[PDB]
Amino acid sequence: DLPDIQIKHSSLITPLQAVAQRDPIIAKQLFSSLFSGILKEMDKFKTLSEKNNITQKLLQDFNRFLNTTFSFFPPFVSCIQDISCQHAALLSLDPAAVSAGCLASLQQPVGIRLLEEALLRPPDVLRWVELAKLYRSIGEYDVLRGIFTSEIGTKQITQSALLAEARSDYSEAAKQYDEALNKQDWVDGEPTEAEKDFWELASLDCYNHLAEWKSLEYCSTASIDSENPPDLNKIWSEPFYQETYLPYMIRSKLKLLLQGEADQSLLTFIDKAMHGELQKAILELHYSQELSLLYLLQDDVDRAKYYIQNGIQSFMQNYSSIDVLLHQSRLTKLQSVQALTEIQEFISFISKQGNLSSQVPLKRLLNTWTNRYPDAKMDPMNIWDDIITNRCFFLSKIEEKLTPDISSLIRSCKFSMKMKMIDSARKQNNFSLAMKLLKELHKESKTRDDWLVSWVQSYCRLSHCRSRSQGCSEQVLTVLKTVSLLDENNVSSYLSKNILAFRDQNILLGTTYRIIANALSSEPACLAEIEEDKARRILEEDSEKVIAGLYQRAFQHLSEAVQAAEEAAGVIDAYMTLADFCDQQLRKEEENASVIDSAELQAYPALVVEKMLKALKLNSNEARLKFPRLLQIIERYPEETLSLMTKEISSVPCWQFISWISHMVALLDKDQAVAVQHSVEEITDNYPQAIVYPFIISSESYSFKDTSTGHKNKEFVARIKSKLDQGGVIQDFINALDQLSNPELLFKDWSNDVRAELAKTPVNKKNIEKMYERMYAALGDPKAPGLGAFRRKFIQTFGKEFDKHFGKGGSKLLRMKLSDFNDITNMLLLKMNKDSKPPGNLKECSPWMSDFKVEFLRNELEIPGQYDGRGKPLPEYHVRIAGFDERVTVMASLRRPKRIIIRGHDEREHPFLVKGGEDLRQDQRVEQLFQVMNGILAQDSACSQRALQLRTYSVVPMTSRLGLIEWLENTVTLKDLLLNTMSQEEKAAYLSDPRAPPCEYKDWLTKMSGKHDVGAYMLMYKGANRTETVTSFRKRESKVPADLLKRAFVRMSTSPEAFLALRSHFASSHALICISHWILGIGDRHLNNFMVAMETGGVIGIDFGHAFGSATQFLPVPELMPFRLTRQFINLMLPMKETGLMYSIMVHALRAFRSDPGLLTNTMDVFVKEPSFDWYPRQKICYAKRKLAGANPAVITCDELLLGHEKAPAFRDYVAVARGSKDHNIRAQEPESGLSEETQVKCLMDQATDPNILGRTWEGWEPWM
C-alpha cells in the first residue's frame, strides 16, 4: 500500500553483488567505490608508517597488474587507473605502463587524467611524453602545443614535427623524425630515452598514415635487430616490443603481402608464435583479422572463418565494455566493423558454389561494394586503406578462381574505389597519399575517356587544395601544371554530350585562373621574376594587363560553367562561385578610382545580384549569409541594374529573409526602398509576427523626404501599419510592458533630454514644444495615462507630490528660458527618489498582464524570440502567451530592469527580461552578427570538426526604450559559480577580509595615488611603474584559491572522461567567445557577463552594451585587454597552459573569420544605415576591417585609446601600457599590421595576460579571478 522502505542490507547488498557478477561496468564501479571508501577509512587509524607501507604494496601490485596483463580489459584497466587517480600516494604508478595499457584499450581519457594529476604535485620528461602520446592517439593536436615547449627540456624538432602532423602532412613529419633519430652531435644536451621512443613511435605512425609499407616494415623490424632481423621470437622478448613494433610489423607485412608480394616470412612467425599459449592468446585476441587475411592468402578458408568469427566476438565483447559516455572510443571501435564484415562476405561468397559460375552474383557484389564506402572526412585513411586493399585482394582472388569482359568489369570497380579513396584523402588533407595514389593510377586513366577526364579533374582539384598552404611563386607553379593537361580534347563524344563533366572542367579551369591571378596580385612581379617558360603562360602590359586577362578568362570559364549548370546543389556551387568571384573583383576595384576598370567590371554588379538571388531561390545558407552584400551593391549602383533585383526578389520564398528583416525595414524611408517592398509586404501578411516589432522600431523614425515620390513611400508604410497590430493587442501589450519600468528612469530620460536642449543654450526651436506632449503624457498629470492607457497606481501620487514644482513647470516653465538655473530640476529629481517605491513586488504594478487571461481570439501574442530565420516558421507550433507569473524580480542595476517570467500556452514557464530604458538594437545586431559568424564558422572544416558554435539568446526590441530579452534556462553567472565553489572559510576571506584582493586593490590605489575614488586610475597610470604593478598583481592574485573552476568541473563531472569533456568544452567555448568578442570589440567582460550552462559546461556571452570599442573609448578608466583570459581560466588547464587548446581554437576561429572578411564587414552596415542612440559608425566598421585583415591588437587598442582619451591627464601612459614593453611582451615586438593569424593570436593573448595591464584595470572587472 506504501513503499516498504524497512529493507535489509542483504536485500541491497545481495542484488548489488548479483549485478556486479553479471556486468563488468557495475563491477568496475563497485570495486572503485569500495576500494576508495576502504582507503579513506584506513586514514583514521593505522598511522603514517604502516599506511605508507600499505600504499607502497598497493602501488607495486598495480604496477604488477598493468605490466602483466595481456588482454587489456577496458573496465579492468580503467578501474586500476582511476583508482590510482583518486589517491595521491598512488599517482606515481608507471607512466610507460599506464600509457601502453590505456592506449591498447581505447581508454585514453582515464590515462590522461592520471598523468595530468601526477604531473601536478627537472621536468618530468617521461610523463610529459606519455601524456603527449595519449593525446596524439586521440587526435588533440590542439593540446600538443602547450606540451612540447623548451621549458620541459625537449627539442625543437619534435615540436615542429608535431605541428607538421597537425595538418595531415605526415611526409614532413616522418622526414623530421628520422632526422631526429639519426642526429649525432646534439649540442644542447642529449634527448631522453622517452623522447627517442616518442620519435620512433611517431615515425611508425607517419609511415602508417602514408602507405609506405616498405618503410613501415623496415622501421618496425630494424629496431629489434639487424642483418635480416630475426622477428621470430625477438619481438616477444623485451615486452616494450609487443605494443610498439608487433602491430606495425604485422600490419606492414600483411598489407604488403596483400598486394602481391611472394614473401613467406610473416607466415612462419605466426606459425611458430602459435606454439606458445601466451603468444597465441595475444595474437588471436588482438588481431583475429590479420590472421584471417593471412590465412586467406594461404587459401586456408576454414582458419579464416574461425579467426574472423573470433574477431567479431572480440569486437562485441570489447565494444560492450567501453563505457557509454566514452565516445570516440566506440567510434574507433566501430570503424573496424565494415572490414570485418567484408572479410566475412568474401568468405561466404567464395565458399558457395552457386556463385563464381555465373556473372550476376559478381556483378551484384561489385555494385554493393561500389555503393558502400567508409565515411569521408571522418574515417581516417587507415580505415580507407583497409577497406580498399581488402577489396582489391578479394577481387584478385575471385578473378583467378573464375574460369568461365570480367577483367575489365573488375578493373572498373577497382578504379572507381581508388578514385573515391583519393577524393576522401584530398578532403582530409592527406595530400601526399592522394598524390601517390594518383600516380600509380595514371596509367589506366588514359585507357578510357571518362576515366581520363575524371583523373585530370581530380588531379587539378587536388592541386587547388594543396595550393592554399603554399605562399606564392610556388602555388602558381602547382596550378600551372594543371592547365597543360586540363585543356585536353575530351570533347571526343564526352564533354560534347556530358554536361556535368563540362561544368566541372569549366569550374576547375576558372578556379585555376583565379588562383594564378590572385597570386600575381599578391606579389606583383616577384612571382614572374622566377619564370623561364612561365612568362608565356602568365602573359597568355606585363604588370596589370596580365592580371586583367587572367581575371577575364577566369570569368569567362566561370560564366560558362553557370550557363552549363542552368541547363540539386550542382548549380548552387556555380552560382556562388560566380557571385563571390565577381563581388571580390568589385571590392578590389572599390578601394581604387578609375573609368576603364568600371567599363570592364560593369557586367558584374547585376550578374552577382541575379545569380545570388537564384541561389536564394534554392535552399542555400551560404547565400542567405551573403544577403546584406546585396544591399550595399544597390546603394552603390542605384542608377543602374536595380529593377533587375526587383524582378529576382519578386520570386524568392517569403521566409528566406526573416533573419534580415531589421535590414529591410531600415530601408523603407530611402529612395530605393522598392525591390524590398514586395518581400516585406508578403512577410507582413504571411507571418504577421516576425515583422511587427522591427517595423515598430523602424516606423518610429523614418523621417521621409517627400521630394520626388514620397507619397507612395508613405503609402506603403501606412498600408503595412494598417496591415499590422491586428487591432490593438500588440500595442497595449507593449504599453503595459512599458508601465512597469521605473517611472523615475523615464524621468531622468526627459531630464537628460531637456538638459541637452535649453539649459545649454536657447537656440533650439520647437523641440521643447515637441517634448511638451510626453512629460504631460508620461509621469505628468495623472489623468493623462488614464486617458491613454492603463493608469499606473503611482502617477496620482506623483501629481499629488509633483504639484508645487510641477505647477510652475506646466505653467511658466513652458518658456522658462532662464537656461542657467537647473538646481530646482536637480532637487526635484532627487526627491522623486526620496519617496520612490521602485519595486512592484507583484504583478498588480501592471494591471494588464496580471489579468491577461486570454478569453477571445485576440490574435494571440505568440511569445517573442522566435522566427530564427532558417526554415519555414510554422507559426502553429510557436508558443503563445497564456499568462504571466504573479511575482517579478528586479535585477540590481542603476537602470533597474525587471525579469518577468511568463507562462506560455503549453503551461510551461518561460523566463524573460524587460528593460524599458535602452535601445537594444545594438544588442540585436550583435546577436545577429554572432549568427553570421557561427554560420561562416560552421563552414570551415577545422572549425566544424571541433563543432565551434557561439551560443546566442533572443533579443527582441519592442520599441525604442523598450526591449525584451530571452532568459536561458539553468545557466549561472561565472561569479556565482566561482563563489559557491569556494568553501565558507575562503568565501568569508575573499569577501570580508581587508587582505582580500577586493580590498587590497583599493588600498593599493589609495596608498599610491592618494585618491579614495575614481580618478585614482588617471594618476595611478602616471604613478607606479611596470615592476610595482606586476608585483602587486602577483601578490594580490596569490590570495584567491587557484582551482575554483577545476573543483566546479570535478564536482559536476562524476567521471574522469566526463571531467575532460567538460573542461575541454568550457575552454573551447570560452576561447571562441574571446576571439569573437575581439573581432567586434566588446569590453566590460566582468565576471557576470559570462554565463555557464550547468547542463553542458559551455560558456555564454552576455550584455553587449559596449558593442564596438567603447569601454576603452568612452569610459573614465579604459579597458586595455582584448578579452577575459584571467588566472582561473589558465589554472583550469594545468598542467598545460593557455598555449595549447585555447590558442589552437582561437587560431582556427581566426582563420575561418579572415578567410572571407567581407561577411562581417557587410553585415555591420546597419550601424551606419540606422545608427542607434548609444564619423561615429564608419570608424567602428573601419577598425573592425583593419583588425580582421591582419593587424597588431595593441595598435588598434592604442588607436581607440587615441580617439577616446586624447589630451587626457595620463593618455601617454595609457598608450605606453597598451603597446607593450618591447622586451617583455610579444605584442610590442611585432609589425603594426600585415600580421599572420598565429602571430596575431600570440600578441592577442599576450595583451590579455599582462600584469602590467591586469594589475591596473577597473576594480569591478575583478582582474585577479
Partner: peptide
C-alpha cells in the same frame, strides 16, 4: 536489522 528504522 532491516535498517531503515522508520516508516512513511
Amino acid at each position: 536489522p532491516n535498517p531503515m528504522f522508520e516508516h512513511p
